[PDB]
C-alpha cells in the first residue's frame, strides 16, 4: 500500500543483507532498564536476540548479560551463562545495544573490536548506541569487507586507539533494519 517499498540492501562488497525487524519499544525500554548505571555515568550493554523466519530476522529478546560497568566500557564477563541461556531458548545473536551516558553517539575503539565478532558471525549484525545526554542514538555496522578486515588485523593493545581509514558506517534509512510494532521481553542475567 501507500508508503511501502521493497528493499534490497547490500554490503560494500556486494553481499545481500537480510532484514532485521527491531521492536519500536526496544531503545526506550533499554534506557529504562539500565537507568541506574546511566545516572552514575556507567555504560551498560544488552544483546539483541531473536529468530530467523521467512528469510528475515526478528529481535524478540533484549538480554542483559553479566558485565563490567565502567565509564567507557561495558564488556561481558560471563559468556558461558549468556550462551547457555541463548542455546536453551533457541535464540540467535543479531547484534547488541549499549549506552554512552555522557559521550557523543559514535563507535569507540572498543565498540569496533566488540562488533567485529558479531558481524563476522552474521553479516547483518548491528550495534545500537544510545547517547541519552545528547538525546540521540544511532545504528552502526563495520564496512564489509574492508572495515571487518581492518579490525581483524588490528593488534593494538590499549583500550582506546585510532584506526586507519574508514572502518564503520551508520545503517542507512531505509536499509536492512526496519522498526515494527512488536512486543518485547527483557531478560536480565544479573
Ligand atoms: Zn560505545
Ligand atoms: Zn583496533
Swiss-Prot record:
Residues 19-149 form the MPN domain. One of its GO terms (biological process) is protein K63-linked deubiquitination. GO terms for molecular function: K63-linked deubiquitinase activity; K63-linked polyubiquitin modification-dependent protein binding; metal-dependent deubiquitinase activity; ubiquitin binding; zinc ion binding. Keywords: Cytoplasm, Endosome, Hydrolase, Metal-binding, Metalloprotease, Phosphoprotein, Protease, Ubl conjugation pathway, Zinc. Zn(2+) 1 binds at residues 98, 100, 111. Zn(2+) 2 binds at residues 113, 154, 161, 163. The record marks 43 as: Indirect zinc-binding. It comes from the Eukaryota. One of its GO terms (cellular component) is endosome. A motif (JAMM motif) lies at residues 98-111. It is found in: Cytoplasm; Endosome. The keyword Protease applies. The JAMM motif is essential for the protease activity. Zinc metalloprotease that specifically cleaves 'Lys-63'-linked polyubiquitin chains. Does not cleave 'Lys-48'-linked polyubiquitin chains. Plays a role in the multivesicular body (MVB) sorting pathway. Required for ubiquitin-dependent sorting of proteins into the endosome and subsequent trafficking to the vacuole. May regulate MVB sorting through deubiquitination of ubiquitinated ESCRT proteins. Belongs to the peptidase M67C family. This is AMSH-like protease sst2. It comes from Schizosaccharomyces pombe (strain 972 / ATCC 24843). The gene is sst2. The chain holds residues 245 to 433 of 435 of the full protein.
Amino acid at each position: 500500500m501507500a508508503g511501502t517499498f521493497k528493499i534490497h540492501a547490500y554490503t560494500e562488497g556486494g553481499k545481500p543483507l537480510r532484514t532485521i525487524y527491531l521492536p519500536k519499544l526496544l531503545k526506550k525500554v533499554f534506557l529504562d532498564v539500565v537507568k541506574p548505571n546511566t545516572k552514575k555515568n556507567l555504560e551498560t550493554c544488552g544483546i539483541l536476540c531473536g529468530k530467523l523466519r521467512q528469510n528475515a530476522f526478528f529481535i524478540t529478546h533484549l538480554v542483559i548479560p553479566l558485565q563490567e560497568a565502567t565509564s567507557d566500557t561495558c564488556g561481558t564477563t560471563d559468556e558461558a551463562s549468556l550462551f547457555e541461556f541463548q542455546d536453551k531458548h533457541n535464540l540467535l545473536t543479531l547484534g547488541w545495544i549499549h549506552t554512552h551516558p555522557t559521550q557523543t553517539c559514535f563507535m569507540s575503539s572498543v565498540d569496533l573490536h566488540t562488533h567485529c565478532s558479531y558481524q563476522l558471525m552474521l553479516p547483518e549484525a548491528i550495534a545500537i548506541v544510545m547517547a541519552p545526554s545528547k538525546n540521540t542514538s544511532g545504528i552502526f555496522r563495520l564496512l564489509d569487507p574492508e572495515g571487518l578486515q581492518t579490525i581483524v588485523k588490528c593488534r593494538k593493545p590499549g583500550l582506546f586507539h585510532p584506526h586507519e581509514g574508514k572502518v564503520y558506517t551508520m545503517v542507512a534509512q531505509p536499509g536492512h533494519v526496519r522498526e515494527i510494532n512488536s512486543k518485547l521481553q527483557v531478560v536480565d542475567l544479573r
